Design a protein around this ligand. Sequence first.
Ligand code: CL
Ligand code: CL
Ligand code: CL
Ligand code: CL
Ligand code: CL
Ligand code: CL
Lengths: 16, 16, 16, 16, 16, 16
Amino acid sequence: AYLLFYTEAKVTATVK
Amino acid sequence: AYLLFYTEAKVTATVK
Amino acid sequence: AYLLFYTEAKVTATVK
Amino acid sequence: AYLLFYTEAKVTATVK
Amino acid sequence: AYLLFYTEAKVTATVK
Amino acid sequence: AYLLFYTEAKVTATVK
Ligand SMILES: [Cl-]
Ligand SMILES: [Cl-]
Ligand SMILES: [Cl-]
Ligand SMILES: [Cl-]
Ligand SMILES: [Cl-]
Ligand SMILES: [Cl-]
């Protein structure tokens, strides 16, 4: 699984 | 485009 | 001291 | 250009 | 568990 | 003072 911080604004974190 | 910080370790940043 | 970003959602930054 | 995550609180991301 | 990025330098990511 | 993560690659952190 990876950790991802993403944004286009707020930073969203997810683990997939 | 998204700004992305990714990791499984080092953090990789990219713009997609 | 460490710089920390954490999240369980929002990313919170702190310096400890 | 730089990718920047900034904070003093919320983390702001920008591309400059 | 929390997602953590930390640094005192390199940024280290972990899940606790 | 602000916390900054920046990159053009490696993420560099700084506190100013
Ligand atoms: Cl490594
Ligand atoms: Cl690194
Ligand atoms: Cl604080
Ligand atoms: Cl806030
Ligand atoms: Cl936020
Ligand atoms: Cl670990």
